[PDB]
Ligand binder design. Structure first.
Ligand SMILES: Cc1cc2nc3c(=O)[nH]c(=O)nc-3n(C[C@H](O)[C@H](O)[C@H](O)COP(=O)(O)OP(=O)(O)OC[C@H]3O[C@@H](n4cnc5c(N)ncnc54)[C@H](O)[C@@H]3O)c2cc1C
Length: 473
């Protein structure tokens, strides 16, 4: 059955292009238009009540029917543009969809190429499971690679009728030229008329570490130099490979004299290491600069980290030897001969990163108004709070920011004043950089958009309308 086959292909799909073609073939076969909101979702499921698909819709329905969404009517007025199909962009898109809003998302890339592996807090694991994650991804389960989290959330966003455009870069805004017009987006390359003319009152920016819209202030604090190295090796799925335990973190304190043993044998002095067994064997480690220079990884000692870890300063062969030697030792050689996975552009998949300079945006939202047309803008994900990767806070905190932005859009749609919406968002924002599974609500099954289910003794007035006046205009 060819609607069934397209749906089956869509579910099982493992390349961004393959998700898109099978989903389009599904829409064609069922006579529906993609990007058609919750109505699309209802029409698709009504045609696919066939048992195999049944538990998928039962989970998505159970989510959609949560009181907070008002059955897809809360934001039925609202038209959003989401920048970025990273995990946190798709996740915010899905919450916006379930609220009833029209949602268009633009992504500069045309594939999901990142293999690095991300740690998941308990709440996010339940969150994903609750979204049909088991039907979408066959494959311990406390971590997930970037691209598989993207494929999963892409298929959810698509079913829920989010309209997504690829190989399009958000470059800023076209303000209302006068009374009666809305906000539009500047886009590269020169967009088709459909996107050129799309007007929205909500912009959610989830463009990652290196982009926020004009008007946002970012805070950069630079601490003690830390240099991170990530590597992905091919994971054949040999029984032997499968039996090698993961290494949850190690470090000084923690699980220490391991680093004693590593240095002798190898000459590698590390601050931390982590091994995740996933689609690849992934390692992340923090290495002393002295040590990277001593072992030929960095070719000289530059004071500016962005130069220190630049292409010109990093030696590919030395970097590869270092990471393989470290990975082999941590695993006691039981992974066999390690082969580097071959990377977004065909290179061996190892790299060095600035683990030191940690941005935090000054606000999570702003409002811009012109000729009587208001635009609400919200940041979500790495562009709001940059994560320190070995501590595993990226997904968790990007997802919380996505719920908190969606809650704010709910409020916006309900008619609260811009200052009221902004002050309440910013009271939530004050908690973000200290959140932990320990200081949040413990029953993660009951987490939903309403922040009271997520943050205990919540204070939505921590920030006042006057404290946010400079965020409005
Ligand atoms: C090279 C790389 C490696 C990483 N490795 C790790 C790791 O090993 N461990 C870990 O914990 N975290 C890692 N991270 C961070 C981790 O991926 C993020 O915490 C997580 O994906 C959530 O990020 P996000 O959705 O906010 O942003 P991202 O994942 O950065 O996604 C941003 C999305 O926006 C798109 N985009 C950017 N600019 C525009 C524009 N102007 N218009 C349209 N689209 C745009 C990007 O193409 C991207 O698809 C890595 C990030 C990168 C970029």
């Amino acid at each position: 059955n060819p609607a069934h086959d397209h749906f089956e292909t869509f579910v099982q799909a493992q390349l961004c292009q393959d998700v898109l073609s099978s989903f389009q073939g599904l829409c064609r076969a069922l006579g529906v238009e993609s990007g058609g909101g919750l109505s699309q979702y209802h029409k698709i499921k009504a045609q696919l009540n066939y048992w195999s698909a049944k538990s998928l819709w039962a989970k998505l329905d159970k989510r959609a029917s949560q009181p907070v969404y008002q059955q897809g009517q809360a934001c039925t007025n609202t038209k959003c543009l989401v920048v970025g199909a990273g995990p946190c962009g798709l996740r915010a898109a899905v919450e916006l969809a379930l609220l009833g809003a029209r949602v268009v998302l633009v992504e500069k890339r045309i594939k999901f190429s990142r293999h690095n592996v991300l740690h998941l807090w308990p709440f996010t694991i339940h969150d994903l499971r609750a979204l049909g994650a088991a039907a979408f991804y066959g494959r311990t389960l406390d971590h997930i690679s970037i691209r598989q989290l993207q494929l999963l959330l892409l298929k959810v966003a698509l079913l829920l009728g989010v309209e997504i455009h690829w190989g399009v870069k958000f470059t800023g805004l076209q303000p209302p030229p006068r009374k009666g017009s809305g906000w539009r987006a500047q886009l590269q390359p020169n967009p088709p008329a459909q996107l050129a003319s799309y007007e929205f009152d909500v912009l959610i920016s989830a463009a990652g570490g290196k982009f926020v819209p004009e008007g946002f202030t970012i805070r950069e604090m630079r601490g003690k130099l830390a240099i991170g190295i990530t590597a992905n090796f091919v994971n054949g799925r040999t029984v032997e490979e499968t039996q090698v335990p993961e290494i949850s973190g190690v470090a000084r304190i923690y699980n220490q004299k391991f680093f004693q043993s590593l240095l002798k044998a190898t000459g590698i002095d590390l601050e931390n290491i982590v091994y995740y067994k996933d689609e690849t064997h992934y390692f992340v480690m923090t290495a002393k600069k002295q040590c990277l220079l001593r072992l030929g990884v960095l070719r000289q000692d530059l004071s500016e980290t962005d130069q220190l870890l630049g292409k010109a300063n990093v030696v590919p062969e030395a970097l590869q030897r270092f990471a393989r030697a470290a990975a082999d030792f941590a695993t006691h050689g039981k992974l066999g001969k390690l082969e580097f996975a071959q990377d977004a552009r065909g290179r061996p998949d190892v790299a060095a990163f600035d683990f030191t300079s940690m941005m935090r945006a000054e606000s999570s939202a702003r409002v811009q108004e012109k000729h009587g047309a208001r635009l609400l803008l919200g940041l979500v994900g790495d562009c709001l709070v940059e994560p320190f990767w070995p501590l595993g806070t990226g997904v968790a905190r990007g997802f919380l920011a996505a719920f908190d932005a969606a809650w704010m859009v709910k409020r916006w749609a309900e008619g609260a004043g811009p200052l009221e919406v902004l002050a309440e968002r910013e009271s939530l924002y004050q908690l973000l950089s200290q959140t932990s599974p320990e200081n949040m609500h413990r029953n993660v099954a009951q987490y939903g958009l309403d922040p009271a289910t997520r943050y205990p003794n919540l204070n939505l007035r921590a920030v006042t309308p006057n404290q946010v006046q400079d965020l409005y205009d």
